[PDB]
Design a protein around this nucleic acid. Structure first.
Ligand SMILES: [Mg+2]
Ligand SMILES: [Mg+2]
Ligand code: NA
Ligand code: NA
Lengths: 95, 95
DNA sequence: ACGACACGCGAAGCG
DNA sequence: ACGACACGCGAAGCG
């Protein structure tokens, strides 16, 4: 049996977000962070036509604590950093 | 409160797949298809290090019936086409 | 490829 | 930036 294809509608789905070291610290390179990636909610899917794109209508800022190791003369200094994630809460087909 | 960040592990998640008109018919252009996009399952996420990538271990072929209109001298001929989707069923960090 | 259907919505049917 | 911890796993603690 071949089922009718169903449209991937415009809505929030779980996507993989890579945590940017650049945003943790832009002025020093001597560090590691964990974890490297987290789940976020993002608007995806396809609208009726190509005059409209699937865009977020409301977004939820979400801070998360990542583990950080600064390497100083080959020894680790343990720190914590806060990364502010953005979740999409709702989407509509737009413009 | 800032919760500990949790790793987006290597596993299957729902992704948006655009249905390729090219695969429906490579030798004629005078047609439309519906729907334009469907949900599929795909391996995503991040492994421990960069010597390994998150790859599928088993995949499930899934045929779906899409609606097709061939436009012939400005009139529509209704047809059905079968698109074979590929779902990822399982993933592991690899190579 | 230039936004049928008594209409509006979706070789459709219902109201 | 060159794959601590009595070890192995994960300024850790448990077995
Ligand atoms: Mg009637
Ligand atoms: Mg001990
Ligand atoms: Na009609
Ligand atoms: Na230890």
């Amino acid at each position: 049996i071949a089922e009718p294809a169903m449209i991937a509608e415009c809505k929030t789905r779980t996507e993989v977000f890579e945590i940017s070291r650049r945003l943790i610290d832009r002025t020093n390179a001597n560090f590691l962070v964990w974890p490297p990636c987290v789940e976020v909610q993002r608007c995806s899917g396809c609208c009726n036509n190509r005059n409209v794109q699937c865009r977020p209508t409301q977004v939820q800022l979400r801070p998360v604590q990542v583990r950080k190791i600064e390497i100083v003369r080959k020894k680790p200094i343990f720190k914590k950093a806060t990364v502010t994630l953005e979740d999409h809460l709702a989407c509509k087909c737009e413009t």
